[PDB]
Amino acid sequence: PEVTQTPSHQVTQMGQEVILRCVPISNHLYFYWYRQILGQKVEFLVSFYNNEISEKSEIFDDQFSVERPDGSNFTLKIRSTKLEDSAMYFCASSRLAGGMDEQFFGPGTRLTVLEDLKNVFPPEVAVFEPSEAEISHTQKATLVCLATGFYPDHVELSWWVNGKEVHSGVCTDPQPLKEQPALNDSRYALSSRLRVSATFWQNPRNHFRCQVQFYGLSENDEWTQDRAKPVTQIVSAEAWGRAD
Amino acid sequence: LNVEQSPQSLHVQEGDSTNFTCSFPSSNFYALHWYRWETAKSPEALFVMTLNGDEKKKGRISATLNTKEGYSYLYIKGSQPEDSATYLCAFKAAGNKLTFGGGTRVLVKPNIQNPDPAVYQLRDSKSSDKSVCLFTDFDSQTNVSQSKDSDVYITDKCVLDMRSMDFKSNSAVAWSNKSDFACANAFNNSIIPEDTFFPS
């Protein structure tokens, strides 16, 4: 059993209301919310038990509220987001609240609060095919995916081989790079590698794809610019294996 | 109020052991929790400690508790790739809330079998004239330095593991908008192996 939270990321404009959702471990009686602002400590927000709040910190002000709408879901509401609310929000649960009770953590929702949404852009995605030199030298074949020109910076890149997500032979940069470091709203670039055997790459019916889940605007977000509204979306690039 | 963790950052070679500490208040102590938080995963609960002088184990990971002096040691025996994480300690007093330390970030460098450092050029799968440079198959002694030039983009190294052959490799990618750029000079600002393969 595991605590679940969806989505992994959310982008909002400052002043807007956000609702963060959790699925505590089914037989647990105590539920919790913690957050971590980047480079700071994981901090307690609130604990909940038997349809009422149990304990709350100073951070859990007038803007925060918790809800237990049924026997399965647990929610944290931020009435009016601040720039300082950008953080990883974790939900946790424990069977009881004794000294020996473990607090099991969810994977978190990373919330990004923006002052303005005018600088939000999805990525361009390109797949780079394996070098013939590497194939002949090693009998291995590395594909490279490059996601570029996106803002904000918390995308989810994945590899799909023959329509199935793969994790074997993959490594993705843990952090994107700034295309223009000197600019505060700089677009970002992120790279990943997928390495397969030369024989696998040389099968012309093996299909490779790099997919990037971008987190952006929602239907509710207002959009008055000429360009396409930068909504949450998936951007992909593909390559088929090559005999020669 | 304050939970300290030190060293804040440690590098360890795969197969080697390491340890680090967490300090917390002795006044009103009820429990100590240790977690292993791997990149983009749920923080993993390792163990809860309540008894002074106790030692708990979860596989190759062990911890100790001194409630009087207010400290705990965390030990990693024969570090493995999955041990690369931020190790978080958290103190519970009478209340439900946990108070966290700032963590110890552990980087477990992979054992690279038969290093064959090379810099390859990869072309876009689409009809574009774009390309990337891939520095790969170097052992864990190599550090990938940043580009002195603003228009040259260089990623940090990441380790991949091909499970179809139990093979691990390091790599870093470089690309540049510059029309004159070349893969032979891309990683010039890094100390790369003498025998690095530059295909012709």
PDB file of all heavy atoms in Angstrom, chain A residues 9 15 25 29 59 63 72 83 104-105 128 237 240 244, unseen atoms left out:
ATOM      1  N   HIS A   9       2.727  17.786 -10.915  1.00  0.00           N
ATOM      2  CA  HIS A   9       2.991  19.221 -11.072  1.00  0.00           C
ATOM      3  C   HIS A   9       1.717  19.986 -11.417  1.00  0.00           C
ATOM      4  O   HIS A   9       0.815  19.445 -12.067  1.00  0.00           O
ATOM      5  CB  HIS A   9       4.032  19.464 -12.190  1.00  0.00           C
ATOM      6  CG  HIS A   9       5.332  18.774 -11.959  1.00  0.00           C
ATOM      7  ND1 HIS A   9       5.508  17.454 -12.289  1.00  0.00           N
ATOM      8  CD2 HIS A   9       6.462  19.240 -11.389  1.00  0.00           C
ATOM      9  CE1 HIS A   9       6.738  17.152 -11.906  1.00  0.00           C
ATOM     10  NE2 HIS A   9       7.354  18.204 -11.377  1.00  0.00           N
ATOM     11  N   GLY A  15      -2.704  34.559  -6.695  1.00  0.00           N
ATOM     12  CA  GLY A  15      -4.038  35.033  -6.351  1.00  0.00           C
ATOM     13  C   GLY A  15      -5.127  34.014  -6.641  1.00  0.00           C
ATOM     14  O   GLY A  15      -6.237  34.146  -6.124  1.00  0.00           O
ATOM     15  N   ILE A  25      -3.468   5.924   2.557  1.00  0.00           N
ATOM     16  CA  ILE A  25      -3.510   4.456   2.634  1.00  0.00           C
ATOM     17  C   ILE A  25      -4.845   4.112   3.324  1.00  0.00           C
ATOM     18  O   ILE A  25      -5.125   4.645   4.402  1.00  0.00           O
ATOM     19  CB  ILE A  25      -2.250   3.895   3.339  1.00  0.00           C
ATOM     20  CG1 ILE A  25      -1.003   4.064   2.420  1.00  0.00           C
ATOM     21  CG2 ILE A  25      -2.436   2.428   3.749  1.00  0.00           C
ATOM     22  CD1 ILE A  25       0.349   3.922   3.123  1.00  0.00           C
ATOM     23  N   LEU A  29      -5.815   6.142   9.842  1.00  0.00           N
ATOM     24  CA  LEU A  29      -6.698   7.067  10.541  1.00  0.00           C
ATOM     25  C   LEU A  29      -6.209   8.500  10.601  1.00  0.00           C
ATOM     26  O   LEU A  29      -7.019   9.410  10.749  1.00  0.00           O
ATOM     27  CB  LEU A  29      -6.999   6.534  11.952  1.00  0.00           C
ATOM     28  CG  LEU A  29      -7.731   5.187  12.032  1.00  0.00           C
ATOM     29  CD1 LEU A  29      -8.021   4.824  13.486  1.00  0.00           C
ATOM     30  CD2 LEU A  29      -9.051   5.193  11.211  1.00  0.00           C
ATOM     31  N   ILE A  59       1.969  28.203   9.239  1.00  0.00           N
ATOM     32  CA  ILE A  59       1.913  28.236   7.766  1.00  0.00           C
ATOM     33  C   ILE A  59       0.466  27.998   7.291  1.00  0.00           C
ATOM     34  O   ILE A  59       0.036  28.604   6.310  1.00  0.00           O
ATOM     35  CB  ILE A  59       2.915  27.240   7.105  1.00  0.00           C
ATOM     36  CG1 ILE A  59       4.304  27.273   7.774  1.00  0.00           C
ATOM     37  CG2 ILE A  59       3.040  27.513   5.603  1.00  0.00           C
ATOM     38  CD1 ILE A  59       5.149  25.949   7.604  1.00  0.00           C
ATOM     39  N   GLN A  63      -5.767  31.348   4.478  1.00  0.00           N
ATOM     40  CA  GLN A  63      -5.843  30.867   3.088  1.00  0.00           C
ATOM     41  C   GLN A  63      -5.970  29.336   2.978  1.00  0.00           C
ATOM     42  O   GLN A  63      -6.541  28.841   1.998  1.00  0.00           O
ATOM     43  CB  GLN A  63      -4.644  31.353   2.235  1.00  0.00           C
ATOM     44  CG  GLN A  63      -4.425  32.878   2.176  1.00  0.00           C
ATOM     45  CD  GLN A  63      -5.605  33.702   1.691  1.00  0.00           C
ATOM     46  OE1 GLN A  63      -6.485  33.237   0.953  1.00  0.00           O
ATOM     47  NE2 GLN A  63      -5.630  34.968   2.088  1.00  0.00           N
ATOM     48  N   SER A  72     -12.269   7.994   0.953  1.00  0.00           N
ATOM     49  CA  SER A  72     -11.109   7.673   0.134  1.00  0.00           C
ATOM     50  C   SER A  72     -10.170   8.843  -0.181  1.00  0.00           C
ATOM     51  O   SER A  72      -8.959   8.648  -0.146  1.00  0.00           O
ATOM     52  CB  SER A  72     -11.532   6.917  -1.131  1.00  0.00           C
ATOM     53  OG  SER A  72     -12.389   7.688  -1.960  1.00  0.00           O
ATOM     54  N   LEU A  83       3.301  33.941  -4.300  1.00  0.00           N
ATOM     55  CA  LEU A  83       4.559  33.535  -4.927  1.00  0.00           C
ATOM     56  C   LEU A  83       5.341  32.555  -3.998  1.00  0.00           C
ATOM     57  O   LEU A  83       5.887  31.560  -4.477  1.00  0.00           O
ATOM     58  CB  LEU A  83       5.371  34.800  -5.296  1.00  0.00           C
ATOM     59  CG  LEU A  83       5.586  35.095  -6.796  1.00  0.00           C
ATOM     60  CD1 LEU A  83       4.348  34.787  -7.655  1.00  0.00           C
ATOM     61  CD2 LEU A  83       6.013  36.526  -7.012  1.00  0.00           C
ATOM     62  N   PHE A 104       3.675   7.502   6.210  1.00  0.00           N
ATOM     63  CA  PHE A 104       3.949   7.104   4.837  1.00  0.00           C
ATOM     64  C   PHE A 104       3.662   8.274   3.915  1.00  0.00           C
ATOM     65  O   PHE A 104       2.611   8.886   4.035  1.00  0.00           O
ATOM     66  CB  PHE A 104       3.126   5.855   4.496  1.00  0.00           C
ATOM     67  CG  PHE A 104       3.553   4.652   5.301  1.00  0.00           C
ATOM     68  CD1 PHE A 104       2.877   4.297   6.466  1.00  0.00           C
ATOM     69  CD2 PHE A 104       4.638   3.875   4.902  1.00  0.00           C
ATOM     70  CE1 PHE A 104       3.278   3.182   7.212  1.00  0.00           C
ATOM     71  CE2 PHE A 104       5.048   2.765   5.658  1.00  0.00           C
ATOM     72  CZ  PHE A 104       4.342   2.407   6.792  1.00  0.00           C
ATOM     73  N   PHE A 105       4.646   8.656   3.065  1.00  0.00           N
ATOM     74  CA  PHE A 105       4.552   9.846   2.222  1.00  0.00           C
ATOM     75  C   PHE A 105       4.133   9.518   0.796  1.00  0.00           C
ATOM     76  O   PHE A 105       4.507   8.471   0.263  1.00  0.00           O
ATOM     77  CB  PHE A 105       5.914  10.581   2.209  1.00  0.00           C
ATOM     78  CG  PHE A 105       6.079  11.574   3.332  1.00  0.00           C
ATOM     79  CD1 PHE A 105       6.161  11.146   4.655  1.00  0.00           C
ATOM     80  CD2 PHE A 105       6.092  12.940   3.076  1.00  0.00           C
ATOM     81  CE1 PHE A 105       6.265  12.067   5.699  1.00  0.00           C
ATOM     82  CE2 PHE A 105       6.211  13.863   4.123  1.00  0.00           C
ATOM     83  CZ  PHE A 105       6.296  13.415   5.424  1.00  0.00           C
ATOM     84  N   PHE A 128      17.269  12.619 -31.576  1.00  0.00           N
ATOM     85  CA  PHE A 128      18.551  12.483 -32.283  1.00  0.00           C
ATOM     86  C   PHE A 128      18.912  10.989 -32.343  1.00  0.00           C
ATOM     87  O   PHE A 128      18.919  10.291 -31.312  1.00  0.00           O
ATOM     88  CB  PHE A 128      19.626  13.354 -31.600  1.00  0.00           C
ATOM     89  CG  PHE A 128      19.286  14.830 -31.689  1.00  0.00           C
ATOM     90  CD1 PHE A 128      18.433  15.428 -30.758  1.00  0.00           C
ATOM     91  CD2 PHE A 128      19.795  15.621 -32.722  1.00  0.00           C
ATOM     92  CE1 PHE A 128      18.110  16.798 -30.854  1.00  0.00           C
ATOM     93  CE2 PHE A 128      19.477  16.986 -32.810  1.00  0.00           C
ATOM     94  CZ  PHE A 128      18.650  17.568 -31.874  1.00  0.00           C
ATOM     95  N   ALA A 237       8.395  13.509 -30.154  1.00  0.00           N
ATOM     96  CA  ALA A 237       9.194  13.338 -31.368  1.00  0.00           C
ATOM     97  C   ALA A 237       9.451  11.830 -31.433  1.00  0.00           C
ATOM     98  O   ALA A 237       9.496  11.177 -30.396  1.00  0.00           O
ATOM     99  CB  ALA A 237      10.499  14.123 -31.296  1.00  0.00           C
ATOM    100  N   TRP A 240      12.193   5.680 -36.137  1.00  0.00           N
ATOM    101  CA  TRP A 240      12.092   4.242 -36.345  1.00  0.00           C
ATOM    102  C   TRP A 240      13.529   3.722 -36.455  1.00  0.00           C
ATOM    103  O   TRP A 240      14.415   4.451 -36.927  1.00  0.00           O
ATOM    104  CB  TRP A 240      11.375   3.939 -37.667  1.00  0.00           C
ATOM    105  CG  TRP A 240       9.900   4.095 -37.582  1.00  0.00           C
ATOM    106  CD1 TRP A 240       9.183   5.240 -37.758  1.00  0.00           C
ATOM    107  CD2 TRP A 240       8.954   3.073 -37.244  1.00  0.00           C
ATOM    108  NE1 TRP A 240       7.839   4.983 -37.607  1.00  0.00           N
ATOM    109  CE2 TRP A 240       7.667   3.659 -37.303  1.00  0.00           C
ATOM    110  CE3 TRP A 240       9.063   1.706 -36.944  1.00  0.00           C
ATOM    111  CZ2 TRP A 240       6.501   2.930 -37.057  1.00  0.00           C
ATOM    112  CZ3 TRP A 240       7.902   0.981 -36.709  1.00  0.00           C
ATOM    113  CH2 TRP A 240       6.639   1.598 -36.752  1.00  0.00           C
ATOM    114  N   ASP A 244      20.168   0.432 -42.367  1.00  0.00           N
ATOM    115  CA  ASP A 244      21.235   1.246 -42.983  1.00  0.00           C
ATOM    116  C   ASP A 244      20.646   2.423 -43.765  1.00  0.00           C
ATOM    117  O   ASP A 244      19.754   3.120 -43.286  1.00  0.00           O
ATOM    118  CB  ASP A 244      22.126   0.415 -43.937  1.00  0.00           C
ATOM    119  CG  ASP A 244      23.359  -0.230 -43.309  1.00  0.00           C
TER     120      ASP A 244
END
